[PDB]
Amino acid sequence: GVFNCETETTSVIPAARLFKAFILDGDNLFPKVAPQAISSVENIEGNGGPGTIKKISFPEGFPFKYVKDRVDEVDHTNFKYNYSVIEGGPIGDTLEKISNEIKIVATPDGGSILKISNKYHTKGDHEVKAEQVKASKEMGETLLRAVESYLLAHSDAYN
Amino acid sequence: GVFNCETETTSVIPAARLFKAFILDGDNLFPKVAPQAISSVENIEGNGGPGTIKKISFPEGFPFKYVKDRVDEVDHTNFKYNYSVIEGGPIGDTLEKISNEIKIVATPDGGSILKISNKYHTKGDHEVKAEQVKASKEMGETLLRAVESYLLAHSDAYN
């Protein structure tokens, strides 16, 4: 089966700056601002460009040890990041892939919204494990607020 | 905000027949085959086509007493049914409307798949209540299963 979840999350950070921090410098910023949630991010294969395989490791005690993501597209004009979750994390049993899109959209007040899509490919009639979707929502919200807080404390970062 | 959920549900019933029974005659069938889920369905306006407002009443002890749904489109050839939840049920507090799109498609084995999209309009930063998503999905499954069982017991119905 295929299950698709599209969400919107508000940020007080301007879209261009948040895109630079959260997407373009995520590999460096995530372990820095949320070290208790992200142990490391490393390139397994490639540069950061389309096709690149990246391994994200999590601290001991978390439900998963690591995940491997494949970078699919990075659109700097439209602040859009497409990637696939292809190994580790929730991949296994009846889940083969998660195809993700993150689009950071400016709002009239000068902040932004993260428009996020998660497309799950499950085996046949099986449904997405609801508590993985929930945990995924929580991990992403934690990273976002940690990035926000860092940016608000460091006005010179990602100008 | 806007939240969108897209699911796929397998049915053993051929697409044309499932559309006839589950969509086109649901008002009649649901209270008869699933009285534990649906108490009644009544047209407040129209007779089932676009613009029709229907009141769906639930059994005693359900979280909600009723919902009002507006029929948006009904495609008899492509087996599409679009409708919106506009009053009662989860509508209130931070949720204004749920816009639903159902598409029934044939599968090679002679059965069908229901492709279902639910778009929630929430107030500002507020999230869609996860328990409403579970409840909506569980309701759909229950009704589909009741209609399936009825159709398999009555081979002359909607054929």
Numbering used by the authors:
A (entry chain A), B (entry chain B): 1 to 159
Anything the authors wrote about it?
Partly conflicting data on the allergenic significance of dimerization were reported for the birch pollen allergen Bet v 1, an outstandingly well characterized model system in immunology. It is the archetypical representative of the pathogenesis related protein family 10. Here, we report crystal structures of dimeric Bet v 1, revealing a noncanonical incorporation of cysteine at position 5 instead of genetically encoded tyrosine. Cysteine polysulfide bridging stabilized different dimeric assemblies, depending on the polysulfide linker length.
We hypothesized that this linker density is related to the observed redox dependence of the dimer. To test this hypothesis, we soaked crystals with β-mercaptoethanol and subsequently determined the crystal structure at a resolution of 1.63 Å. Residues 5A and 5B were no longer connected, but the linker electron density apparently vanished upon reduction. The resulting electron density at position 5 could be consistently interpreted as cysteine. The reduction was accompanied by a reorientation of the neighboring Phe3 side chains in both monomers for ∼170°, now partly occupying the position of the phenol rings of tyrosine observed in WT Bet v 1.
